[PDB]
Amino acid sequence: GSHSMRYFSTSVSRPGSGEPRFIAVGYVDDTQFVRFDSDAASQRMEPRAPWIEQEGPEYWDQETRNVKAHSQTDRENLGTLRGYYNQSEAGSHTIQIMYGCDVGSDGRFLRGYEQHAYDGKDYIALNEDLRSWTAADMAAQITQRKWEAARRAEQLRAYLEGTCVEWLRRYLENGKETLQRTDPPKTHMTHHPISDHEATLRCWALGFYPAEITLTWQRDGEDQTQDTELVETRPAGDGTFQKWAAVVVPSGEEQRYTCHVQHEGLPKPLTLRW
């Protein structure tokens, strides 16, 4: 039962008089728990899970203060990167950041992350060793050298191994009723004749948490991938997730085709047929 905390932010410039739109969200595993939207009236970090509302005004005052500073730094960085790339003021550009940490079931640090993108492409990221950087191009190596001179990796590593882990532990305890649950998928099969020779089988997984799941088809005992379709795992809207997998088969030969469902909430994988 390893766990993760991730923070995401997106800053989008708005050419003309306007300031950028900054949106930040935080997640514990697959459960969002905070948001900030610079366009919103509150100008505060806001709760998005019940188990974070118990934090006191001191928690919210600091989160609000720091997320506003983050938005202002990204506003400045949009100008810096525009300069590196010799880009005009006329276009909208986007800076994205993801960061956070993983812990094991004993609540101890496993892995840390900090990745940056510009206009939807890699820009610079912290390496797995939390001591070195990967820059995508020469602009990003200007940034890299600034961060090397500032010893940023050490300072960021202290956050990822320290603060990030300890607060993830706190959230996991305060939300244990829901975050340390596994909801197994409920599975069923549907069947749609196409023609005198073909039929569609669709294998459903509903109501599961966390989102990680594997659906696979087997024909007479070996994995079947030709003539299959797998949709992206999608939110149900109530905290659980959904997925389906389909295969086109000769009509009347559906008994050959077994759907296999793997999920951490299942003692053993489920198999099902029409």
Partner: peptide, 9 residues
């Protein structure tokens, strides 16, 4: 809890 500051690029 979020990090204290974002870095200048």
């Amino acid at each position: 809890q979020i990090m204290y500051n974002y870095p200048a690029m």
